[PDB]
Structure 1
Amino acid sequence: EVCNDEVDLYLLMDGSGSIRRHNWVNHAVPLAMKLIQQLNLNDNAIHLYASVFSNNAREIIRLHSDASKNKEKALIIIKSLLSTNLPYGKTSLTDALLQVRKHLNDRINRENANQLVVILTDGIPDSIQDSLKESRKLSDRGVKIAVFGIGQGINVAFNRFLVGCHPSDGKCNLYADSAWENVKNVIGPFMKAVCVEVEK
């Protein structure tokens, strides 16, 4: 499919109280599933890491595990989110980003694979400063960061600043946003744009 390269992909998904339960069930979780359908998870291709951030970041798919490089097993884990009490709590994007940085510091990532973080969010993180501090630390290590905004509660400027684009003007391939009802129609072209840019 799309996104067929050697990439360690870290999927950070918002599961905070800012999301209505209806949107979590009908849109957020199916979106995460459709995003993964756009990936070729395999031994020599994409390796998936996934977490959901609320008050803290919960790791649901370990990097380099079986579900990490198997799409079938990954969808099962993502689908199992519906059996939890999510969504709730604050929006700790920082903690999620901190986990990614710890993975790099421990050299868990593949030495020769591109490093990509993909953030699905519907609102602002609790700390603008700390999440921006972590994102720049990552991007200084060659980690590409992509943001997928959802709904009317997002901050467009912040999302684009987190990516590394101008907060307002110019085209930004590593950023896209969408209304809740339209998320599954946008994620495809978004991932396709993200892929091409990472390969550069």
Structure 2
Amino acid sequence: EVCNDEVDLYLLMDCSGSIRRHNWVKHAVPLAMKLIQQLNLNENAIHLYANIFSNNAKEIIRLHSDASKNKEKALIIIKSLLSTNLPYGRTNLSDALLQVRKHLNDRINRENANQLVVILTDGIPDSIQDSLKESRKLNDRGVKIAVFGIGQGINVAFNRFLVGCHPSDGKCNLYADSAWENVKNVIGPFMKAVCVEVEK
């Protein structure tokens, strides 16, 4: 797998109404699945955490749980997102990022592990101010943030700012975007690039 190191990886998956149900089912859920396929989930390698966020953040995979460390178990849970009332609601990224910072506050994370947040989003946060404030607090605790933007509702400058890049210029290995139909072709190269940056 292209991601293979001691990393606590916090997947924050936008489930906002803008997505549309057909895209949630045909693209968003399969994209999260393929992303997880890029990870060596293992006690001594990657441990996954996952939440969804729209109105609020909701944990779906607990950090260090069996599904955190086992790809087949993680994929069952992600697939279970199909049998829900999702997608719906707004884009409370700051609450999603807050849940990550609560793990760090409470020392739930492996202190020895690289800390990586990966955001899948099709929009702009409802509060850029609070999202950037949370992101700074995470950065101060050593957390790297990556963003995979989808569709026409994103703001590239903001996503680039969030991950620590110049908003328009130069290579930004912690950022990629894609049209809805193409997400599964962009996610592999993205996760490869992200994991190279995390290891360096």
Q: Please give the range of the TM-score, normalised by the shorter of the 2 chains.
A: over 0.9
Per-residue CA deviation, residues 47-83 of structure 1 (Å, 9 max, x unaligned), is 0000000111010000000000000000000000000
Residue 141 (structure 1) shift: 1.1
Question: What is the aligned length?
Answer: 200
Separation in structure 1 between the aligned mates of residue 129 and residue 71 of structure 2, nearest angstrom? 35
Separation in structure 1 between the aligned mates of residue 169 and residue 113 of structure 2, nearest angstrom? 31
User: Aligned to 2:17, what secondary structure does the other structure show?
Assistant: coil
Structure 2 residue ranges without an equivalent (≥5): none
Per-residue CA deviation, residues 9-44 of structure 1 (Å, 9 max, x unaligned), is 000000011211111111000000000000000000
Separation in structure 1 between the aligned mates of residue 89 and residue 164 of structure 2, nearest angstrom? 27
Separation in structure 2 between the aligned mates of residue 88 and residue 20 of structure 1, nearest angstrom? 8
Per-residue CA deviation, residues 127-165 of structure 1 (Å, 9 max, x unaligned), is 010001100110111100000000011100000010010
Per-residue CA deviation, residues 92-122 of structure 1 (Å, 9 max, x unaligned), is 1010000000000000000100000000000
Residue 90 (structure 1) shift: 1.1
Counting aligned pairs with the same residue, the percent is 95
Separation in structure 2 between the aligned mates of residue 22 and residue 76 of structure 1, nearest angstrom? 20
TM-score w.r.t. the length of structure 1 is 0.99
Separation in structure 2 between the aligned mates of residue 111 and residue 140 of structure 1, nearest angstrom? 14
Separation in structure 1 between the aligned mates of residue 99 and residue 164 of structure 2, nearest angstrom? 20
Structure 1 residue ranges without an equivalent (≥5): none
Residue 125 (structure 1) shift: 1.0
User: Aligned to 1:69, what secondary structure does the other structure show?
Assistant: coil
TM-score w.r.t. the length of structure 2 is 0.99
Q: Give the superposed CA RMSD.
A: 0.5
| Runs of 4+ that moved beyond 4 A | none
